[PDB]
């Protein structure tokens, strides 16, 4: 069960005067953090979100993310108007970084456009990707002239971003280390055919993501099961769908299991 | 050259800040007493017009006037015996070396003495 | 973030060097360290900056032996002259590269360049 922090941020231009900047941030699974146009700050959403920063530490982070902002929309009019690029933009950058035992860690800043990857920052400087539309070799000439930006986005990645991870897992261990046991149920599934009919199982409320689900005839497990994306919850949790279509004679004294880290060793097993 | 500003207590002083920032975004005052180390008492953010002050300092006491552009004062209330000192304001910079680094350039400094 | 400067006075003669120890506590991973050079006019003027993940700094006739395991920042002005003879100031940056950031001082080391 890993626990990379992802700085996800939409930048939406309509036109060269209207303009939107949201932002978020995931510690694992768990959202930590908001960033809405609106706000003049970055919302804290966990009790154990600001880490182990003092309010004077977690005010300089806000400082950078606003400067960060108005400068990021400042650059992208700038490179449009340079480039002449259509003013419909989705510019989208995803941060962060994962720390690992014995100090270890690794960091990332990947930036996409119109929902390509365009760039990224390596080591020291900001590198286009593989399929680079050309113009992003202009951008990257311009950005790659601003040493402090460059000396910034290191500090920011090599070290206080695995600081703020160190922070967030010793402040939220109450939360992140939680368990919730999910409720499986048996449904009537729709027929593919005639004599054909597919069965679905169901199981929601899990808090911990990691979950193996599976249909069986006994103690051994039946091979042509289907299961759906982890779905989430507003309540935290989540939910999973698996089907598996029979033909109508192999569904009479059915049996199931789903293992979880939240159930005590025994898996709960739903029967018909 | 550092200035002196002479006052008594329970009055107020004005120290004038010593730099010319054209592009000034954040004032940060120093004071710096006779044995003791150099410490920040608040900064000043040019744009939003406000006072940032340390923790433990009381509101009121510290104030940052612009009476014009480009123009500093740190302004005192109800002076004590340990306001006095050497007072400092400050500027990341990047600078007369011209580096791509900001450093913090400090002013000529005013001495305050608190006389009764 | 605290700082310490050990040394109140030192005397060095003429043409030699001198050593400025200093040792730092700080709550950042990653921060900058910065030298100063107080005048008898109170004048404050910066000398070096050292920083966490850089080689050890040399500005001129400044040099910056950072060990970043024991934190010390010792400063060493090499080929000395009298108007070197000032008050030396260790400065540790809160991180120190944001224009909203204050520096933590140390209490600061006479030199007095002997002729």
């Known amino acids: 069960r890993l626990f990379p922090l992802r700085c996800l941020q939409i930048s939406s231009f309509a036109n060269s005067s209207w303009t939107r900047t949201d932002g978020l941030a995931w510690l694992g699974e768990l959202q930590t953090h908001s960033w809405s146009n609106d706000s003049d700050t970055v919302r804290s959403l966990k009790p154990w979100s600001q880490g182990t920063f003092s309010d004077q530490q977690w005010e300089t982070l806000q400082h950078i993310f606003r400067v960060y902002r108005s400068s990021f929309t400042r650059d992208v009019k700038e490179f449009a108007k340079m480039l002449r690029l259509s003013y419909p933009l989705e510019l989208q950058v995803s941060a962060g970084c994962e720390v690992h035992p014995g100090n270890a860690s690794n960091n990332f800043f990947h930036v996409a456009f119109q929902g390509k990857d365009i760039l990224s920052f390596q080591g020291t400087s900001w590198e286009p990707t593989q399929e680079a539309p050309l113009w992003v070799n202009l951008a990257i000439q311009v950005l790659n002239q601003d040493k402090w930006t460059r000396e910034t986005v290191q500090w920011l990645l090599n070290g206080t971003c695995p600081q703020f991870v160190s922070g967030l897992l010793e402040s939220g261990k109450s939360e992140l280390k939680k368990q919730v046991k999910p409720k499986a149920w048996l449904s009537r599934g729709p027929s593919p055919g005639p004599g054909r009919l597919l069965l679905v199982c169901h199981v929601s409320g899990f808090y911990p993501k990691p979950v193996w689900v599976k249909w069986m005839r006994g103690e051994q497990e039946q091979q042509g099961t289907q299961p759906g994306d982890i779905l989430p919850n507003a309540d935290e949790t989540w939910y999973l769908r698996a089907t598996l279509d029979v033909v109508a004679g192999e569904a009479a004294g059915l049996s199931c299991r789903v293992k979880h880290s939240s159930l005590e060793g025994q898996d709960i097993v739903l029967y018909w | 050259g550092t200035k002196s500003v002479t006052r008594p207590t329970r009055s107020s002083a004005e120290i004038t800040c010593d730099l010319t920032?054209?592009?000034?975004?954040?004032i940060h005052w120093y004071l710096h007493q006779e044995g003791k180390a150099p410490q920040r008492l608040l900064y000043?953010?040019?744009?939003?017009?406000?006072?940032?002050?340390e923790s433990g300092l009381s509101p009121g006491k510290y104030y940052t006037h612009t009476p014009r552009r480009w123009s500093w004062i740190l302004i005192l209330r109800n002076l004590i015996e340990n306001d006095s000192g050497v007072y400092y304001c400050?500027?990341?910079?990047?600078?007369?070396?011209?580096?791509?680094?900001?450093?913090?350039?400090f002013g000529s400094g005013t001495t305050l003495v608190v006389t009764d | 973030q605290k700082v310490t400067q050990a040394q109140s006075s030192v005397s060095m003669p003429v043409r030699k060097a001198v050593t400025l120890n200093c040792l730092y506590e700080?709550?950042?991973?990653?921060?900058?360290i910065f030298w100063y050079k107080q005048l008898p006019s109170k004048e404050m003027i910066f000398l070096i900056r050292?920083?966490?993940?850089?080689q050890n700094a040399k500005s001129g006739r400044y040099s910056v032996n950072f060990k970043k395991a024991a934190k010390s920042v010792a400063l060493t002005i090499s080929a000395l002259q009298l108007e070197d003879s000032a008050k030396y100031f260790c400065?540790?940056?809160?991180?120190?590269?944001?224009?909203?950031?204050?520096?933590?001082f140390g209490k600061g080391t006479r030199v007095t360049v002997e002729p």
């Open positions: 700080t709550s950042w991973w990653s921060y900058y």
């Open positions: 400065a540790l940056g809160d991180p120190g590269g944001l224009n909203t950031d204050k520096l933590i």
């Open positions: 920032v054209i592009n000034a975004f954040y």
């Open positions: 400050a500027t990341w910079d990047r600078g007369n070396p011209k580096t791509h680094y900001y450093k913090k350039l």
């Open positions: 050292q920083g966490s993940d850089e």
């Open positions: 000043y953010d040019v744009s939003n017009s406000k006072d940032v002050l």
